[model samples]
Target: EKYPIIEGAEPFYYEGNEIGILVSHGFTGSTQSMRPLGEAYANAGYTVCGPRLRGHGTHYEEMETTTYQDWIHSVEEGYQWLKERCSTIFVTGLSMGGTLTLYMAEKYPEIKGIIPINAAIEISYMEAAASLEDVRFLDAIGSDIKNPDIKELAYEKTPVKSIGEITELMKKVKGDLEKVNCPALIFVSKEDHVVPPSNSQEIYSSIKSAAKELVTLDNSYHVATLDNDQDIIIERTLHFLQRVLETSSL
Candidate 1:
C-alpha cells in the first residue's frame, strides 16, 4: 500500500519497420527506465517493445510472489511478439534485464545481437540474503541512478526470496556465457554503486561473442541508461544496431 503504480511504467511497444528490438527493464524497476530507449529506437523506424515484467510496476506484495524465471519468461514472451512480425530481432536490457538479454542470446541463436548495460554477473547483497532464512524482504536499492534529478519508480522494498532466485539465475547465466556466441555490446559505469563495474568486464571476457565491445560510461552510475551518459548510450546503441543490421544481412 505504500507504493502506488507510477504512470508511464506500463509495458510499451511500437510497431515501426521490419527491424525489431526488445528492451527489458531491471528488477524492481518498471518499464519507465527503458521507455526512453525503446522510443528512441521506434523514432528511428525500428519496431520496439519494453515489456514490464510480472509483478513489477505495482504493489510490492505482488513482486514477492514472482520468481526470476517469471521475469525471463516475460521477456521471452515479448521477443515472441516481435518475432512474429519482424525478420530480425535484437535484445537490449539494463541490469537484470541485461542478464536476461544474455540468457536469451544463449538460448536463441536467431537473435541478431544483444546489448547489456551494467548487467550483473554477481550481486553483492545476494550472499547475505542466502544466509537469511526467516527474512522475506529487505530495503530496496532499485533506483540506483547517479542523476539526482532522475528518479526510477520501483518497489519501496525488495523481496528476499526473489533476490535468491536472481542469484541462482545469475549462476545459470554465468555457466552458459560461453554459449552466447552472438554479437554483443556491453556498457559499464565507472561509478556504479549497485552492481560492480567488474560484472561488465566479466561478461565481456566470459561471453563467447566473437564481435564484442565494452563501452565505459565515465559520467554515469548503475542506471547509465537514464543517467548522465544517456545520450551516449542511445547514440552508441543506434550505431551498434545499424552496424549489426547491415552485417547480418550479408
Candidate 2:
C-alpha cells in the first residue's frame, strides 16, 4: 500500500586494488545515490563499497522499523567486507551517511581519510521533530538536490520515530568528533534546505584531524554528490584519496 523499493536501489560493490573506499548514502536514501561515486572510485583503480542502510531502499514504513544502530551496522559490515580485501580504506557519505562516516572515523582510526558531504551534525528540522510527543511521520524531505533532471530514490516520507534514533546517534557522534584524527575533507553546500550548513562548520571545527579541509560548494544544494558539483565532488574525492593513499604508503 506504501512505497516499494525503487529499481536500481540495491547495494553495490566494486573490486579494484589495495585501496578501498566505503561510500554511504543519506537517510531515507539507497545505494542508488551513492553508486556513482563508488563507480567513479573503482574506475580510478580503488575498490569501493556502498551499502544500502537497513530499513531503507524499501518502504518508508519499513524504515520506521529500523534504528540508527541498524544503519551503523550496515556501514560497519561494508567496512569489514572491504577491510578483508584491501589494505587501506577511506570513508565518504552524504547527509546522515556523512554522520555515519564521522562515527566510523571516530571508532576506526585506521580509516585513511574521511569525506563527509553535507553531513548533518545538526538538523533543525530533526531538532524540532524531537520535541513532538506523538508524531509518527513527517512529510518527506528526501531528494533535496538542485538538479531538476536528477532524482534521488528515497523514502517519500520521513519516519518520526527514526528521528529520535538519529538524534541519539548524533549526540554520540558530536561528543566523539575530537577522536576523528584522520585526514578529512568536509563539504558543505552554500544553499541547503535539509541540513543546516553550520553542521559542516561544527564538524570541521570539532574534528581533531590535523590535515582536515572544508570545501564549500557554491552551485550545489544539500545533495552535492548528485548536484551540479557532482564532478567536483568526484574529482576532489579521488584526488584526496590518492594523496592520502600515497602519504600512508610512504
Candidate 3:
C-alpha cells in the first residue's frame, strides 16, 4: 500500500453466503462510514465488502490528485471482486458513495437492488463554484452530523478540483437515472447540511424502477449511517434486502 490506512477506515471483506453487498463511503470519507451497515449484512450471512474510495482514508491531500473516474474504478474492482465469489450482488453507500451506487446499477443491470443514502445529484452553488476554480481547497464539508457525540472520520479541508469532478459525475449520473431499473431503497435525511433531501426525491422520480421506496431519515444528518437513525437504515435495509432476494430468487 502506497499510503497508510486510517485506523478505522481500512477496507473490509467478510465471507458469508452467495449473496454479496458492496458498500461505499463519501467523497472525503472512507470505509468507516459504511462499515456499520456492512457488518449488518455480514451478520445476516451475506458476503460484504467496503471499498475505500480512491485517495480517501489516507489523507485529504491525496484526494486532490484523484478523480471521480478513479474512485469509480475502485468500486468497480470491489463489485467484480464480490461478483466472482457470489451468486447475486446488491449495492449501497453514503453521499458520493451513493452516487457511484446508482452509476453501477445503471452500468451493470445485473445488480439486484440499491440503497443510496443522501446521494448527491446536484449542487445549488454551481455557477459560483466555477469562479473559485483557482481556489485549491475549501472548508471541509464533512462532520455535518446531528449527534454531538458522534463524528465521522473526514477531512477538515476539501479539494476544489475534486469537487468539480464530483459535480461533473453527478450531472452525468443524473442524466442516466432512468436507466436504473432494479429494486431500490433511497434514503433522505430531513436536515442534511450537505446534500439536500430533494436530491433523493429527484432520484426516486427519475429512476424507472417499478420497485422503489423513498425512505425519510428524520433523526440523522448527512452521515445517517453513523447518526441517530443508523438502526433505522440497517433494519429497513435488511428487510428490503430479504424481500428482494426472495422475489428475485424466484
Candidate 4:
C-alpha cells in the first residue's frame, strides 16, 4: 500500500445471505461514508461489500497520483469479491461512487439493480478543470452532509488531476448510458452544494432502464448517504432490494 488506510476509512465486508450488495464511497472518501448503509443492508440479511476507492481515505496527495480507472478497478475487485459468495448482486453508491456503480451496471447486464445517490453524469466545471494547473490542487469537496454532526471521512483537498480524470469517466459513462438496462433507483438531494441536482435528472433520463425511478432527497446534500435523510435512503433501498429480488426470482 502506498499509504496506510486512515482510521475509520477501512474497507468493510458483512456476511449474510446470497443477495450481495456492493456499497461504494465517493471520490476521496473512505468506506466510512457508506458503511452505515452497508451495515444496514447486512443487518437486513443481505451480504455487503464496501470498497475504498484507490487514492481515497488516505491522503489527497495520493489521489493526485491516481486516475478514475484505478478507482474503477477497486470497485471491480469489490464486486468480484461478492460474486464469489453470492448468487445475486446489486450495486449502489454516493456521488462519484454512484458514478462507478452506474459504470458497472452499464458494463454488466447481470447486475440486478442499481441505486445511485447524486451520481455525476455531467458537471460544468470539469471542462474548465482540464486547463487549470492540476498540481495546484484545490479545496476539498467532501463532507457535504446536511447534518452538522455527520462528516464523511475524506481528503482535505481536491486534486485537479483527479477532476480531469472524472471528466473523462463521466464522458465515457454518459455515452454508454443506453447500455444500463437494469432496474435503477436514482436519488438527488433537492439542495446540494457539490454536484448539481440536475446531474441526477440527466442520469435518470439518459439511462435506458425500463425499470427505473427518480427519487428526491429533500433533506440531504451531496453526501446523501451520510446526511439527514439516511433513514429514508436505508428504508427505500431495502425495499428496492426486496422488490428486485422477488421479481428476479421469478
Q: TM per model?
A: 0.95, 0.95, 0.96, 0.96
Instruction: In angstroms, give how far residue 33 of model 3 lies from its true place.
Output: 1.1
Model 4 misplaced regions, further than 4 Å = 248-250
Colliding pairs, model 3: none
lDDT of 2 by residue, 13-110 (tens): 89899889999998888888888888999999988999989888988888988888999999999999999999989999999999999999999988
The local lDDT score (0 to 100) that residue 150 gets in candidate 4 is: 81
lDDT, candidate 1, 1-250, per-residue tens = 5655568788998999889999999888889888889999999999998898988998778888888889988998999899888999999999889989999998999999999999988976786785688987888877787789998878899888788878888889988999998899999999988888999999999988889999999999888888999999899999999998777445
Give a tens-digit lDDT track for model 4, residues 210-233: 899989999998888888999999
lDDT for 158 (candidate 2): 87
Model 2 regions lying over 4 Å from their true place: 1-5, 248-250
Better of 3 and 4 by lDDT: 3
Clashes of each: 0, 0, 0, 0
Residue 189, model 1, lDDT: 96
Q: Please, what is the whole-model Cα lDDT of each candidate in the order they appear? A: 0.88, 0.89, 0.91, 0.89
lDDT by residue for model 3 over 35-152, one digit each (tens)?
A: 8899988999999999988899998888889988999999999998998899899999999999999999989999999999999889767435634847988888888889999988
Off by over 4 Å in 1: 1-5, 248-250
Error of 2 at 101 (Å): 0.4
Q: For candidate 2, what is the lDDT?
A: 0.89
lDDT of 3: 0.91
> lDDT (0-100) at residue 174 of candidate 4?
82
